[PDB]
Amino acid sequence: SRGELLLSLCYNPSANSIIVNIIKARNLKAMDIGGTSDPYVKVWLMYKDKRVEKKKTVTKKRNLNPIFNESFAFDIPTEKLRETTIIITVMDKDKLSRNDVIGKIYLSWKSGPGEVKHWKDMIARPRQPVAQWHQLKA
Numbered sequence: 001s002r003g004e005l006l007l008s009l010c011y012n013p014s015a016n017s018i019i020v021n022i023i024k025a026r027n028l029k030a031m032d033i034g035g036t037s038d039p040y041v042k043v044w045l046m047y048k049d050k051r052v053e054k055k056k057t058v059t060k061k062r063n064l065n066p067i068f069n070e071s072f073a074f075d076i077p078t079e080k081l082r083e084t085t086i087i088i089t090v091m092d093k094d095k096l097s098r099n100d101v102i103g104k105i106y107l108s109w110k111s112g113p114g115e116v117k118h119w120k121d122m123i124a125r126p127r128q129p130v131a132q133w134h135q136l137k138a
């Protein structure tokens with residue numbers, strides 16, 4: 001409806017890290033009818049309701065199927081995994097006004113069905129990049 005984003009999660013428990021690989025998106029929704037978009041992807045590491053880190057891909061001008069292939073590493077100790085949320089947002093860069101939200105993804109053990117599945121797959125396959133498509137929720 002708003003597009004899909006393909007990303008992988010790799011949780012290395014001995015290293016206490018989660019690597020987030022923003023791979024690509026497809027069928028992004030444009031602002032106008034028949035127009036284009038300038039998508040970039042934001043990644044926030046959350047602990048409870050507090051932001052721990054923020055990351056950001058480069059922008060892909062005039063591209064509704066952007067390829068990013070960017071990886072971000074986050075430190076997460078075991079005692080905070082249960083309170084961890086990774087929020088991924090596909091944005092639409094606008095030089096004139098405020099950048100619009102295309103879709104958001106909340107990754108944790110207590111999120112939507114597709115998000116919980118991806119999270120559990122990450123937990124169950126430590127040290128493997130688990131990749132999965134996600135519908136973008138407005």
Ligand SMILES: O=P(O)(O)O[C@H]1[C@H](OP(=O)(O)O)[C@@H](OP(=O)(O)O)[C@H](OP(=O)(O)O)[C@@H](OP(=O)(O)O)[C@H]1OP(=O)(O)O
Pocket residue numbers: 042054056091099
């Ligand atoms: O000025 P922009 O290129 O549009 O980006 C800003 C900028 O983020 P970056 O500087 O990390 O690129 C803000 O951060 P500051 O420079 O003030 O530190 C950030 O604000 P917060 O990180 O404090 O949230 C804001 O994001 P927000 O939408 O949450 O206000 C974000 O704007 P975009 O996400 O729309 O690009």
Ligand SMILES: O=P(O)(O)O[C@H]1[C@H](OP(=O)(O)O)[C@@H](OP(=O)(O)O)[C@H](OP(=O)(O)O)[C@@H](OP(=O)(O)O)[C@H]1OP(=O)(O)O
Pocket residue numbers: none
């Ligand atoms: O949804 P996925 O499993 O990730 O695979 C898709 C899918 O490929 P298959 O349908 O053969 O699995 C697309 O195919 P169509 O829906 O068009 O039939 C294809 O798109 P194109 O063949 O039209 O190129 C795309 O390839 P790409 O994203 O490189 O354009 C490819 O993505 P994967 O690279 O993830 O296989």
